[PDB]
């Protein structure tokens, strides 16, 4: 029942989030294409695996890809640049591609089954990534008349994500193309993260960089 924390790689971004990404909660990052959402997702996929003193929870990660954003070659560079074995870091990230919105919900029943199997092991799942959470729902429910249903399907998927985060004590990290964090391009390849409407965290901004290590100050 202790709320775990995952470092994002950047200490200024971790400060804004009150210590990092929370287990038993969903953290949403939104912004335009190229604002760093997937780089943050890839950095977290590595960070989670690290011991607490280094910013992780000694866990494994699951990655649900909706629009082919997963880059194992990028995860290998981040693992290498942080002094880890890239093939071992890769082995600890379960990847699954969602082809449609209904397949996306079905993937959560598979994540649930996988989480149970790895629960007693020395490396339980501590992170679930959903890259471009809303892309399939917007593709399939177009126009004024399918707005009610899209919102209904989306709310249902969010209810499911909340249940998994609470019963397995995992962080859920979701990305959303343009807890909520707005990402934006800053000056000189810098990125600005702005925290919006957090109940117990003040609004503020955090500037960070995209490097060979993924995300850092």
Residues in the annotated binding site: 31-38
How was this structure obtained? X-ray
List all residues 6 or more positions away from 17 whose beta carbon is below 8 Å from its beta carbon.
Answer: 8, 27, 179, 181, 195, 201
Nearest to 133 by CA among 66, 184, 70: 66
What's the Cα-to-Cα distance from 2 to each of 5, 22, 170, rounded to whole Å? Answer: 9, 10, 11
Give dist(CA 18, CA 200) in Å, integer. 9
Give dist(CA 84, CA 43) in Å, integer. 13
List all residues 6 or more positions away from 113 whose beta carbon is below 8 Å from its beta carbon.
Answer: none
Q: Which two tokens stand for residue 152?
A: 């209904």
Residues in the annotated binding site for ATP: 31-38
Phi and psi at 33, nearest 5°, equal -60, 130
Q: How many helices (H) and strands (E) does the chain have?
A: 7, 11
Which DSSP string do the residues of 135-200 spell out, in sequence order? Answer: HHHHHHS-SGGGHHHHHHHHHHHHHHHHHHHHHTT-EEEEEEE--EEEEEE-STTEEEEEEES-TT
Give dist(CA 156, CA 189) in Å, integer. 37
Q: Which two tokens stand for residue 134?
A: 């809303």
Last residue before each gap in the chain (C to N over 2.5 A): 178
Give dist(CA 122, CA 119) in Å, integer. 8
Which domains are seen in the chain, by residue range?
1-217 (3.40.50.300)
Under DSSP, the state recorded for 59 is -
**To one decimal place, what's the resolution in Å?**
2.0
- Cβ–Cβ under 8 Å, residues 188 and 41: no
Which residues are 25's β-sheet partners?
171
Which residues are 174's β-sheet partners?
130
């Amino acid at each position: 029942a202790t709320i775990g924390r995952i470092s994002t790689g950047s200490k200024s971004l971790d400060k804004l989030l009150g210590g990092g990404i929370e287990t038993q909660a969903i953290t949403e990052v939104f912004g335009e294409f190229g604002s760093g959402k997937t780089q943050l997702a890839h950095t977290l996929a590595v960070m989670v695996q690290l011991p607490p003193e280094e910013g992780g929870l000694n866990g494994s990660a699951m990655y649900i890809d909706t629009e082919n954003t997963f880059r194992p070659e990028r995860l290998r560079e981040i693992a290498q640049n942080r002094g880890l074995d890239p093939d071992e870091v890769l082995d600890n990230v379960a990847y699954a591609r969602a082809f449609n919105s209904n397949h996306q919900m079905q993937l959560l029943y598979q994540a649930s089954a996988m989480m149970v199997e790895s629960l007693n092991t020395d490396r339980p799942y501590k992170l679930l990534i959903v890259d471009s959470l809303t892309s399939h729902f917007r593709s399939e429910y177009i126009g004024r008349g399918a707005l009610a249903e899209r919102q209904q399907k989306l709310a249902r998927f969010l209810r499911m994500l909340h249940r998994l985060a609470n019963e397995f004590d995992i962080a859920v990290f979701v990305t959303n193309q343009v807890l909520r964090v707005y990402l934006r391009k800053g000056k000189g390849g810098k990125r600005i993260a702005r925290l919006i409407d957090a109940p117990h965290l003040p609004e503020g901004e955090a500037v960070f960089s995209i490097t060979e290590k993924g995300i850092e100050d």
